[PDB]
Amino acid sequence: LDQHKIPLEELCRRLGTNTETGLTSSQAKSHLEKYGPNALTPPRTTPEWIKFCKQLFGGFQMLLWIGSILCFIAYTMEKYKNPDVLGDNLYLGLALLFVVIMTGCFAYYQDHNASKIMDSFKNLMPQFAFVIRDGKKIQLKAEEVTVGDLVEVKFGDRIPADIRITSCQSMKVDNSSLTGESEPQSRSTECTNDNPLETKNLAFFFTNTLEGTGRGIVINVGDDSVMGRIACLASSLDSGKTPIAREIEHFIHIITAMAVSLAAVFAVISFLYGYTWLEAAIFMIGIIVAKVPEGLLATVTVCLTLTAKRMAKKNCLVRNLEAVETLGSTSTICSDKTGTLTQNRMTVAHMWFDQKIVTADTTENQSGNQLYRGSKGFPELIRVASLCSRAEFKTEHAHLPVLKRDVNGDASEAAILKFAEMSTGSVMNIRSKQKKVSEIPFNSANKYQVSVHEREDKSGYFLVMKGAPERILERCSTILIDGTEIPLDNHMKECFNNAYMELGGMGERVLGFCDFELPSDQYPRGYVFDADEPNFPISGLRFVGLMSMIDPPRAAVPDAVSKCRSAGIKVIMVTGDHPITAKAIARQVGIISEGHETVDDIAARLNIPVSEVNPRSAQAAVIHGNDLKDMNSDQLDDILRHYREIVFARTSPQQKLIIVEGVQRQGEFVAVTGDGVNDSPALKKADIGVAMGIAGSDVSKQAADMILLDDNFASIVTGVEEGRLIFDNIKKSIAYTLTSKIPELSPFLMYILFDLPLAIGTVTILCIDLGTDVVPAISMAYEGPEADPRKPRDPVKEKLVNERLISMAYGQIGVMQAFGGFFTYFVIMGECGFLPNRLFGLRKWWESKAYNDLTDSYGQEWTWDARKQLEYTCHTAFFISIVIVQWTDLIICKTRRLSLFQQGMKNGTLNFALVFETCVAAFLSYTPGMDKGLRMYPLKIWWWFPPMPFSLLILVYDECRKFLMRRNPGGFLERETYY
Amino acid sequence: TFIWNSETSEFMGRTGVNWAKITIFYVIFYTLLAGFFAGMLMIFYQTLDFKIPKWQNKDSLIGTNPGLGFRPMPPEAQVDSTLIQFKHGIKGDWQYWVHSLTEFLEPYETLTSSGQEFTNCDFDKPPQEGKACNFNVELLGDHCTKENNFGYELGKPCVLIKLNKIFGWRPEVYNSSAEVPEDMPADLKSYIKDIETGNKTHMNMVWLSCEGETANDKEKIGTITYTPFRGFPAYYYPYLNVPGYLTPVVALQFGSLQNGQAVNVECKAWANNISRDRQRRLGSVHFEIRMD
Numbered sequence A: 001l002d003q004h005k006i007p008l009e010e011l012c013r014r015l016g017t018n019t020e021t022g023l024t025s026s027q028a029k030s031h032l033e034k035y036g037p038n039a040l041t042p043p044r045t046t047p048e049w050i051k052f053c054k055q056l057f058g059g060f061q062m063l064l065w066i067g068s069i070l071c072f073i074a075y076t077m078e079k080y081k082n083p084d085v086l087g088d089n090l091y092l093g094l095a096l097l098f099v100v101i102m103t104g105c106f107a108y109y110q111d112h113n114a115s116k117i118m119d120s121f122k123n124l125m126p127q128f129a130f131v132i133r134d135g136k137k138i139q140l141k142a143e144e145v146t147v148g149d150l151v152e153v154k155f156g157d158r159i160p161a162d163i164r165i166t167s168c169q170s171m172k173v174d175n176s177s178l179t180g181e182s183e184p185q186s187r188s189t190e191c192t193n194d195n196p197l198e199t200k201n202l203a204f205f206f207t208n209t210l211e212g213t214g215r216g217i218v219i220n221v222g223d224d225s226v227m228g229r230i231a232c233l234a235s236s237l238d239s240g241k242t243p244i245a246r247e248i249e250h251f252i253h254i255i256t257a258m259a260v261s262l263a264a265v266f267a268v269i270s271f272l273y274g275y276t277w278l279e280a281a282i283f284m285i286g287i288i289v290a291k292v293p294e295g296l297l298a299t300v301t302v303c304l305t306l307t308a309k310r311m312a313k314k315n316c317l318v319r320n321l322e323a324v325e326t327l328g329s330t331s332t333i334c335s336d337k338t339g340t341l342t343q344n345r346m347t348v349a350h351m352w353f354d355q356k357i358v359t360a361d362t363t364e365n366q367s368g369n370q371l372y373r374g375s376k377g378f379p380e381l382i383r384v385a386s387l388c389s390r391a392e393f394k395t396e397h398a399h400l401p402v403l404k405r406d407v408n409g410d411a412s413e414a415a416i417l418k419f420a421e422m423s424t425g426s427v428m429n430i431r432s433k434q435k436k437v438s439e440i441p442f443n444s445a446n447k448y449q450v451s452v453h454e455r456e457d458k459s460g461y462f463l464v465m466k467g468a469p470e471r472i473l474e475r476c477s478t479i480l481i482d483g484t485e486i487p488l489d490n491h492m493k494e495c496f497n498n499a500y501m502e503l504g505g506m507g508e509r510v511l512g513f514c515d516f517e518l519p520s521d522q523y524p525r526g527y528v529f530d531a532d533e534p535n536f537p538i539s540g541l542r543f544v545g546l547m548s549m550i551d552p553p554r555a556a557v558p559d560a561v562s563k564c565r566s567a568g569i570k571v572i573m574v575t576g577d578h579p580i581t582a583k584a585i586a587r588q589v590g591i592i593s594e595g596h597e598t599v600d601d602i603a604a605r606l607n608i609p610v611s612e613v614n615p616r617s618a619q620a621a622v623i624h625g626n627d628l629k630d631m632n633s634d635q636l637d638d639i640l641r642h643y644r645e646i647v648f649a650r651t652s653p654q655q656k657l658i659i660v661e662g663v664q665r666q667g668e669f670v671a672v673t674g675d676g677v678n679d680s681p682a683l684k685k686a687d688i689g690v691a692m693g694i695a696g697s698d699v700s701k702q703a704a705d706m707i708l709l710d711d712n713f714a715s716i717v718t719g720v721e722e723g724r725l726i727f728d729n730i731k732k733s734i735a736y737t738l739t740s741k742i743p744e745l746s747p748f749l750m751y752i753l754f755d756l757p758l759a760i761g762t763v764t765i766l767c768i769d770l771g772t773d774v775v776p777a778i779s780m781a782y783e784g785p786e787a788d789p790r791k792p793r794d795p796v797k798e799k800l801v802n803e804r805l806i807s808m809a810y811g812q813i814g815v816m817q818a819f820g821g822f823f824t825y826f827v828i829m830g831e832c833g834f835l836p837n838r839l840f841g842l843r844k845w846w847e848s849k850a851y852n853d854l855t856d857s858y859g860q861e862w863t864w865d866a867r868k869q870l871e872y873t874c875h876t877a878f879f880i881s882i883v884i885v886q887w888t889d890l891i892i893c894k895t896r897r898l899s900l901f902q903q904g905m906k907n908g909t910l911n912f913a914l915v916f917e918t919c920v921a922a923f924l925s926y927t928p929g930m931d932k933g934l935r936m937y938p939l940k941i942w943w944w945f946p947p948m949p950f951s952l953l954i955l956v957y958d959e960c961r962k963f964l965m966r967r968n969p970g971g972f973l974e975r976e977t978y979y
Numbered sequence B: 001t002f003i004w005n006s007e008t009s010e011f012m013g014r015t016g017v018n019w020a021k022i023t024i025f026y027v028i029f030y031t032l033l034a035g036f037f038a039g040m041l042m043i044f045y046q047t048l049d050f051k052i053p054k055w056q057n058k059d060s061l062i063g064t065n066p067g068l069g070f071r072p073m074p075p076e077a078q079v080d081s082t083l084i085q086f087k088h089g090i091k092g093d094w095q096y097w098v099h100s101l102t103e104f105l106e107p108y109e110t111l112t113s114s115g116q117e118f119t120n121c122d123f124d125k126p127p128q129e130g131k132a133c134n135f136n137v138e139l140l141g142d143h144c145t146k147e148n149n150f151g152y153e154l155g156k157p158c159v160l161i162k163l164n165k166i167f168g169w170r171p172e173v174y175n176s177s178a179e180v181p182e183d184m185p186a187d188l189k190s191y192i193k194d195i196e197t198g199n200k201t202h203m204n205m206v207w208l209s210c211e212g213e214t215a216n217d218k219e220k221i222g223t224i225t226y227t228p229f230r231g232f233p234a235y236y237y238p239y240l241n242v243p244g245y246l247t248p249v250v251a252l253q254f255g256s257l258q259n260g261q262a263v264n265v266e267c268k269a270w271a272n273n274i275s276r277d278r279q280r281r282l283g284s285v286h287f288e289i290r291m292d
């Protein structure tokens, strides 16, 4: 697109446009039918039902689909081969189906991204102002406007569409939706450079033009305008899969791998063992219900919910549940200067007076050092700073503090007024004590401000005068030094430039201040001053000093960027401002460390070609958008790896996407913090997009996965620690609920390898995963940190589940739960009559209803009912034994490197969870009614004790290992048991 | 993509020495784990009476409700069914049932021939402690004898029935012809009245009654000849696991059974502290007999 470069006549003949009438109605209809979007096309969306439906299927739910169907078939076999079979497999069939839906509904709530960023562009451009088609101005609708159409923009009418500026005067617009900066930019009908985004010759779709009329022909309308492209590109963008989701999908793939492999194996050793179709069918619903954790994906969803509830109490709202953690696994965090790292409040920083430069306080809370008030040049300068025709506050915001009060004027005029108001306390007193009689407004070439003020003693006239320092250097003949008016000599001129260029060195926009005392004899009381033709001296004034203005950081920012870089997270500035201002803020906030110089700085010091300067020598980078435009992905990845403190400046909104996609090439998870419409693509493309809650635009909020309602950038550091904490706590919930799968599974594989009567029932299993072992698993979301993961796995560069966790859940700790469970099963069978010698080889007769007189080891004969009643009591006891050996499992999973006596049992939910674990088990096994479908029978008070010794063994074993692994650090023990 | 990396050891997870270390660690872990489990099982064992159950009678889940069981039993690998199949006549499949019935009744003839601790009990003679009451085979008549092929020869099979031996069980029998409940077959009520009119001692016993289950099985089963007493006696039952215990048996005798027609039978005991249920099969047994 080079239409801004080509002259007006060329574009007019390209589009058939006229500089005086633009187009006719028929040509307007033709352009509409050719293309009439003139708006952001709504995005393609998928309904909720299809997203939910595809969420009903997974690795843990597809298996429960096969399990649920199988018992439905099993119940059919029983019914047509036994017309009076009670309903046990059918209700179990329904139960497993409900688990699919409830877990298929917990997953949906985890991924419920509600970001209607297209509907967030509610502003757009309602009530289009004026169009010169048909030789008449029409206040027509917002969208009807098309290309080749002459528009009439005025003050604050949101330029209707991308127009090639044709004619205008005093035209200033604010493309704050393009580069984030809201400072007015003067537009003229002349292209200034090749890049169309930095020419005064071209307007844009989204600019709430401050002043200057303006005439332009519409180059394009929507979906091709600069704003139109971004909105379409922001809408048609997805981060992909969040880091925690990728780990969870990896977790599901691992467990489904064993479950489908084990069930496939046991469909072979079953059919080769003589099991009938029903016996294998009843068996299959055992080894695919014990294996799959029915209450694990739901557990993780609630665990993320709890920490999102806790982290929202720090004014940190979260839109996507899984986005809570990805601030912990992130390693490179892009940012924005104006609005995110700075207050977006142009304020004075440095003051030149009496050949001295001192820093001025910039904190919002005004906690800085006011050590300069005692300076001799302070009162005169602030008097000049206040009496220079000034600006004014607002009455309707008078009650707000001085910094929060709104003003009328330019940003430069605002900055001096707040500083004077803050310094003198109340400059209205100076207004009352110093009346105004004359003023000269800011022009477009001379742009000075001359005003006349009546002297307090009513003896003469005071002259106030500020402007660009170079312009008033020639207009000043004397300089105030230490309260003494000194004529301007060669030394002062060199000193003036030295401070002036030094002040511009930190990118701080500056303006000079000077005054003059009108003689009383030549200008007595009642003297009349002519503004059009000045009757007062204009040149050779008394120079006072230089004021500086720069957008300063917030209070929390310098600490946050320091701690983020300390936690392994590199920080990269990605702004849209000029490199000089970006480099000044980047060094100030802490992105560029002090004493670290880029190629330009190093070459500058060596006075040599920057090209010959070795890139390695330099550390930071100030890469400009133009340089970023013509380099490909090869060099881009090099500079992202070679340096560590890169500062990208003058970047178009589409270039931030290139940066984020560039960083993600290394395999890192990027985070973007922004405020404006320009960074919306970066917020949608990054793994986690953090926005601003007060100084942020509407689209930036709606296109972000997190909102900082308090604007405190220090909440990022807290989000990092809480993100890395919830990841570890989730891992400690996984290692706890995976230790129940082998004690649940072992009775089934002990039922087929050897011929033992079943120990655990399938219905009993559902009372563990969906029942007791939910609150303790939820409780681990409350566990506090131990030591620091800052150095170990800085951005949590590890898997959620690995071989060490499986070997410690399916291996060591898990087996000691199965042995503890079976010890109770052998105790009850042995005590009631069935000795272990008789038990092995009894599977065929135990289930069979043919034998009503199966004999135990003492010569008794049990019926089918008394046999099954005994088996169900062991089913209850195995359940409670699993629960009892789960008290120790929780306590030893509370910690991971430190011993329990060091950490201390100080987790309110966990202590309550242990009480909840026992009470549910006790209630579910000691109340009349639950032997009628849950197969749960009262237990003797002596049958809760057998699993207790195995509980103590697990606790003694784990704590013992912890001591060994905390000792002998890096020991193979830790190398193969530290999950 | 194999990514096997066998050249730099790396047997998919570790080097050879690392695998050796993890294997010896797992081996010892499981070894002392099995040692702990076996030690606990032995500790539990040393607190068991191998002659008397730890929980007896009503404390256990066996309860005070016994159940019957037909002896002939199906062949092994047919543990699901309760069907007795045979063809009457010289060229028949009677051999398995006859041999099984002979094997079951083996202790009632060999050890009873000596009877060192056996006691010739009777209704008015209580057993001596540590002595199992005798049960002579001749008490089962002549037709239920291995000599006449246990009746599986002429087409008149005879099936033994026995009570569950619940440890320490104390049967309570009806003390009058009016105490008996309803729902008892009229045949058993008439038998009870005859016993009460005759020797009053014989009424102290548990009463058996076999009948067809399905309404048609009532009339397709024919008459039944309980060759011994019509129900078990009441002077065997305080079981207490006496060595060489012989459970009393009531020998049915299906005199009239139609050829090639299945019959499902259900026999229930009749004592005051005995329940009966057609579904849980408490206090009753269910076997199916079909003759071809």
Ligand code: ALF
Pocket (backbone or CB within 6 Å): A178, A179, A180, A181, A336, A337, A338, A339, A574, A575, A576, A577, A675, A676, A678, A679
């Ligand atoms: F400061 Al910006 F996009 F808001 F560069």
